[PDB]
Amino acid sequence: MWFEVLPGIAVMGVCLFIPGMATARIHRFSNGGKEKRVAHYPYQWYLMERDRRVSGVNRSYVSKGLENI
Amino acid sequence: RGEYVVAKLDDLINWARRSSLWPMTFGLACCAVEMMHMAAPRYDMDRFGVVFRASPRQSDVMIVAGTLTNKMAPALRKVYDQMPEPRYVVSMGSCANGGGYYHYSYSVVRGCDRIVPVDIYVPGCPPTAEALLYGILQLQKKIKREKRLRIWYRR
Amino acid sequence: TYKYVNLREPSMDMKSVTDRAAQTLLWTELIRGLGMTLSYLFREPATINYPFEKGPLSPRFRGEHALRRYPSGEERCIACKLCEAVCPAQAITIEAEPRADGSRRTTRYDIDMTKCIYCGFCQEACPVDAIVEGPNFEFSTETHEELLYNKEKLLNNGDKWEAEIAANIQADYLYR
Amino acid sequence: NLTLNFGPQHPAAHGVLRLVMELSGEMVRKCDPHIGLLHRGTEKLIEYKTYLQALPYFDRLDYVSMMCNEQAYSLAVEKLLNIRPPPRAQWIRVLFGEITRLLNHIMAVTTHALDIGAMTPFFWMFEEREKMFEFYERVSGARMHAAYVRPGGVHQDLPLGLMDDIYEFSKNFSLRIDELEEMLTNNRIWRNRTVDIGIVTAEDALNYGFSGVMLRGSGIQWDLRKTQPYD
Amino acid sequence: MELLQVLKRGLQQVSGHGGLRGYLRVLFRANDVRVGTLVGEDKYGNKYYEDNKQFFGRHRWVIYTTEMNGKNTFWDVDGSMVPPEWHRWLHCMTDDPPTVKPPTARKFIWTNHKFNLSGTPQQYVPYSTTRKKIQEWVPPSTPYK
Amino acid sequence: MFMINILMLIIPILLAVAFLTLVERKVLGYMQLRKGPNVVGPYGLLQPIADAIKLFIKEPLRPATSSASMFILAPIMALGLALTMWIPLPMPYPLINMNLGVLFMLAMSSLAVYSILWSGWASNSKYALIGALRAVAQTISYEVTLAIILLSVLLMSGSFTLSTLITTQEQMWLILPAWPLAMMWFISTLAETNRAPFDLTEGESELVYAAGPFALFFMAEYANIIMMNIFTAILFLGTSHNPHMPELYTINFTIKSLLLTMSFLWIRASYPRFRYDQLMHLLWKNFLPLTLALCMWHVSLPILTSGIPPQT
Amino acid sequence: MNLMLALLTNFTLATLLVIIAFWLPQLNVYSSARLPFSMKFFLVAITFLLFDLEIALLLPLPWASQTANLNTMLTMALFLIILLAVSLAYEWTQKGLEWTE
Ligand SMILES: CCCCCCCCCCCCCCCCCC(=O)OC[C@H](COP(=O)(O)OCCN)OC(=O)CCCCCCCCCCCCCCCCC
Ligand SMILES: N=C(N)NC(=N)NCCc1ccc(I)c(Cl)c1
Ligand code: SF4
Ligand code: SF4
Ligand code: SF4
């Protein structure tokens, strides 16, 4: 019966689901729980390098707020 | 132990090879029609892992389904020689089994086992699609009994 | 009396011409063909679960041969050789002589099951219902020699299958 | 002129038919069928059989139209014997002759579609073929080579309840033809593979010895069931 | 919502086989978890079921025994294991099971059915059943030349 | 941590490819009034594993190769490129976030034709080579429309970044303003990947040569079928992205890809096969004229509607 | 460095799989130069190449639409596509798209 096709479909679904899920979670793990910063242009890259220096730990994802002022 | 290892490796490749038997059919004559009915929805050979249309380059079992004439014998042997191993042959129907109703003819090979080795003989003129399925399932059990690795280990 | 299968005039009014233009560009017949295959995906398949389910057969089915007996256990065959005469394939070979008790009985009764065409002419020709084609069709073998039946093999088939063979003959003999 | 002859300088086996074709690019310039690969000397073997013994050879000719082959041989022998089969036998023979026609046209149409890619009507219709094989098996004990139609009539009478099942099967079969037509008749890809392909004129068909649909396809009004009827 | 009543039918198959182990056992042996009426059981352990709501072909089936004639048939089942008295019923050559219309007993009928024996030590080996036809002359034992 | 990411992309791809074989055989079966695999494992779930093992312990084909190095190269080329096509795909976050991700995929897809060509040279057979050239001619022909169709859609997106297609389709799928292009794009992916009714390499292998691992070429081909359909979903059926619950995107986006892939299955079950010249005419005389006209239309349309997208 | 790693991994695994697909079966021990090929196929390849080159000039169009010189951009964008269409019209009428003969 047609619903016996579903188990194979479900296995494919889980297999395709992992790449998108693994990438999203690894990004959060590596970037202080936030999205990996996108730097497509020199301005975006420049602000990232500035952030790395301002962080004080050499990590561009460690934000520093008004506590530094 | 090494005995127990080869016992399970044998069980593994044997399970894989009989769960994925890909036939190429010489539909030479009548018996090809019953072979088509075994692929047809009622019996659905594909549900056993036996794909319907397989190229000779990827085939594991040859089914001689029909009369093998003298004029065709060289072509049958050619295809058999090109099948990669392991390869098995199922002889289907009286004609292929031993000439059948044209046994005494001048142009008919009296059994395909004169040209190629045969593993299973399916009797009938023609065997019912379910009779051919019985022979295919009997070939699987023949493969299940194989013990290449255990014999290699004991060389 | 006859009919035309493809003698039709396509209308050339703008409505009809636009109907074929929308068909060409929007693939309507192709999508209609997709509907038919979709309706089959949701139909119950016709597959049966062999070997746990079997295709239906009738009492007349022609399968593996067997030599039968009388209720007393005496062989029905009397070495008349009518089966051997009619066999279109010459698959039957018979020899006979007087038995120790004087009965007319066979000393050889072979069927080359790789010559046999399973035509059933032998059971039609037999005057005493001795040779029959039984209901068994699952006797494929691994060697050629296993399919060259002699009298011992054929009698064993009869003893093995008599329960079913008798019931099948009971069902069909009024049509013979 | 590339050539495909299935031999040295061409590693490939032929099969049932050895077609030796010479092509110019994509076009076929000559098509040379080499047959005899299923020649079995049936006509010589029949000379050693009695008329009844030779009957099963005709099941194994057009092995898709078994009972029709039996009928042609039976009519020839009845004509030479100067006898006729009884009316019920003639009606049974026409009934199974038309069932046999369904068996053949299903096979012809669906394998023709399969050979060019449309693989699915073959499965839907071969379930219908399987049911018709049961009618063969119920009257003769054999699914294909019934040997049921014999000179003088038929071998055995229909078992009780067979006609009812044939009625049930026929009642639904036209819807199966409709489903087959829904896949093929109006499909632009099917039409592009068959329209204006293998055109034969009415005169060429006659002089080349064609018959059946090969004649009627070109408009010739001929059918032996009408012009030279039998049974 | 028939979805729920479809699912309930699914669960009743689990209980219809006597728990999950029975449901799994028939799923992996016979690749089918349907529940049918028990029509009978032969002397070898094969169980025969019917379900007349199924389309013709699937309305009768056999769950083979796990051991026949000393052979382990838990996974290795075979169509030839069906004895003749049930063979007629399972192939729809009749309507009546042997539990209702048993076969005619005979002295010579096998009491123990055998499945296909090809490829085993029990396989059939052909031979000529006739005796020697030409007798040779045996020379005398005492010398005399 | 990035290497853990690469393997979490490669390994599931090969598994999804493996179980697409099972899904294809079962969906084709039920459309044909049968079941397909249901014995090898429950519901045939072990069938892909049995087939994989069997192929990999089969004897190699015995015709001698005309080029040893280039016999190895073809499968490596084919499989390596197939895996490479997945690294820029945003699901919703790409493994590699490429500014010109669309161009990268177009460029890599155009190199996958080399495996077809190289396997022809290594075949040591003129018929094998002639077959390889025919497939290449078909492949490159439909690359023409895919590139132009792709360019037309990007004129509503405004960049070559793939994740920008998600922003473009925030309010509405691109299949609505571009359904004429979606129709042609979908058929081109069928003919691009030698899929029925465009599987003529195996259609014309019929009647009336040294060959690499069938398994390696098969896996590459089926990875491309999934990737093509994933790309179709992103390009036309854009999924909304919630940055705080990314897994919601991955569920819906996956389902769209599965359905699109199942439609490839649905389509080989339904139609007969084109003749070679007729699918060449389908491109050069039908798709390409419309694609050129719609490329012109889609250059004009943003300008005349004042709907030009931003660069970033 | 990530793209190099991804590329290196993709082909190393492809290479690894290929070799074991070459040797794993060996764990068992199972016992003149002008191709006869139509000139029409050469023209397909050449036609693809020339259309591929024109497609290269159209690829910058998404960025080109960002200029204040939209009157010139649109004119040249259409000019190129029209000439691309004129080339197809020339091949078509000259029977270059045919396969007969
Ligand atoms: C307001 C201003 C607006 C301006 C813009 C207006 C544009 C809209 C109006 C135009 C519509 C454009 C349609 C674009 C689709 C392409 C249409 C097409 O090319 O069809 C013709 C082609 C050949 O047809 P043929 O019968 O051979 O006749 C001509 C041959 N000389 O036919 C074929 O393509 C052959 C069929 C091939 C497909 C067979 C297999 C698939 C069929 C089912 C697929 C279903 C579609 C899936 C959709 C995917 C969505 C992601
Ligand atoms: N289902 C198809 N696509 N047809 C087909 N070739 N079936 C055979 C199944 C198969 C082939 C290659 C691999 I690797 C795997 Cl794992 C399974
Ligand atoms: S064995 Fe019987 S059915 Fe098969 S080809 Fe020979 S005559 Fe025909
Ligand atoms: S069934 Fe026919 S061919 Fe077979 S032994 Fe009987 S008469 Fe001879
Ligand atoms: S089996 Fe019947 S027909 Fe044949 S020899 Fe014996 S009695 Fe005569």
UniProtKB/Swiss-Prot annotation, chain B:
The keyword Chaperone does not apply. It is found in: Mitochondrion inner membrane. The keyword Mitochondrion applies. It is an enzyme of class 7 (translocase). [4Fe-4S] cluster binds at C30, C31, C95, C125. Keywords: 4Fe-4S, Electron transport, Hydroxylation, Iron, Iron-sulfur, Membrane, Metal-binding, Mitochondrion, Mitochondrion inner membrane, NAD, Oxidoreductase, Respiratory chain, Transit peptide, Translocase, Transport, Ubiquinone. It is a peripheral membrane protein. GO terms for biological process: aerobic respiration; electron transport coupled proton transport; mitochondrial electron transport, NADH to ubiquinone; mitochondrial respiratory chain complex I assembly. GO terms for cellular component: mitochondrial inner membrane; respiratory chain complex I. GO terms for molecular function: 4 iron, 4 sulfur cluster binding; metal ion binding; NADH dehydrogenase (ubiquinone) activity; quinone binding. It catalyses: a ubiquinone + NADH + 5 H(+)(in) = a ubiquinol + NAD(+) + 4 H(+)(out). Its EC number is 7.1.1.2. Its cofactor is [4Fe-4S] cluster. Binds 1 [4Fe-4S] cluster. The modification Hydroxyarginine is found at R53. Coiled coil: none annotated. Hydroxylated ar Arg-53 by NDUFAF5 early in the pathway of assembly of complex I, before the formation of the juncture between peripheral and membrane arms. Core subunit of respiratory chain NADH dehydrogenase (Complex I) which is composed of 45 different subunits. This is a component of the iron-sulfur (IP) fragment of the enzyme. Belongs to the complex I 20 kDa subunit family. This is NADH dehydrogenase [ubiquinone] iron-sulfur protein 7, mitochondrial. The chain holds residues 62 to 216 of 216 of the full protein.
From Swiss-Prot, chain C:
Its cofactor is [4Fe-4S] cluster. Its main location: mitochondrion. Its EC number is 7.1.1.2. Residues 68-97, 107-136 form the 4Fe-4S ferredoxin-type domain. The keyword Lipid biosynthesis does not apply. [4Fe-4S] cluster 1 binds at C77, C80, C83, C126. GO terms for biological process: mitochondrial electron transport, NADH to ubiquinone; mitochondrial respiratory chain complex I assembly. The gene is NDUFS8. It is found in: Mitochondrion inner membrane. [4Fe-4S] cluster 2 binds at C87, C116, C119, C122. Belongs to the complex I 23 kDa subunit family. It catalyses: a ubiquinone + NADH + 5 H(+)(in) = a ubiquinol + NAD(+) + 4 H(+)(out). This is NADH dehydrogenase [ubiquinone] iron-sulfur protein 8, mitochondrial. GO terms for cellular component: mitochondrial inner membrane; respiratory chain complex I. Core subunit of the mitochondrial membrane respiratory chain NADH dehydrogenase (Complex I) which catalyzes electron transfer from NADH through the respiratory chain, using ubiquinone as an electron acceptor. Essential for the catalytic activity and assembly of complex I. It comes from Bos taurus (Bovine). Binds 2 [4Fe-4S] clusters per subunit. The lineage of its organism: Eukaryota, Metazoa, Chordata, Craniata, Vertebrata. One of its GO terms (molecular function) is 4 iron, 4 sulfur cluster binding. The chain holds residues 37 to 212 of 212 of the full protein. Core subunit of respiratory chain NADH dehydrogenase (Complex I) which is composed of 45 different subunits. This is a component of the iron-sulfur (IP) fragment of the enzyme. Interacts with RAB5IF. It is a peripheral membrane protein. Coiled coil: none annotated.
Curated annotation (Swiss-Prot), chain E:
The modification N-acetylmethionine is found at M1. The keyword Nucleus does not apply. InterPro entries: NDUFA12. This is NADH dehydrogenase [ubiquinone] 1 alpha subcomplex subunit 12. It comes from Bos taurus. Keywords: Acetylation, Electron transport, Membrane, Mitochondrion, Mitochondrion inner membrane, Respiratory chain, Transport. It is found in: Mitochondrion inner membrane. Accessory subunit of the mitochondrial membrane respiratory chain NADH dehydrogenase (Complex I), that is believed not to be involved in catalysis. Complex I functions in the transfer of electrons from NADH to the respiratory chain. The immediate electron acceptor for the enzyme is believed to be ubiquinone. The gene is NDUFA12. One of its GO terms (cellular component) is mitochondrial inner membrane. Belongs to the complex I NDUFA12 subunit family. It is a peripheral membrane protein. It comes from the Eukaryota. Complex I is composed of 45 different subunits.
Swiss-Prot record, chain F:
It is found in: Mitochondrion inner membrane. Belongs to the complex I subunit 1 family. It is a multi-pass membrane protein. One of its GO terms (biological process) is aerobic respiration. HAMAP family: NDH1_NuoH. The gene is MT-ND1. Core subunit of respiratory chain NADH dehydrogenase (Complex I) which is composed of 45 different subunits. This is NADH-ubiquinone oxidoreductase chain 1. It catalyses: a ubiquinone + NADH + 5 H(+)(in) = a ubiquinol + NAD(+) + 4 H(+)(out). The keyword Transmembrane helix applies. Its EC number is 7.1.1.2. Core subunit of the mitochondrial membrane respiratory chain NADH dehydrogenase (Complex I) which catalyzes electron transfer from NADH through the respiratory chain, using ubiquinone as an electron acceptor. Essential for the catalytic activity of complex I. Essential for the assembly of complex I. The keyword Cytoplasm does not apply. The modification N-formylmethionine is found at M1. It comes from Bos taurus (Bovine).
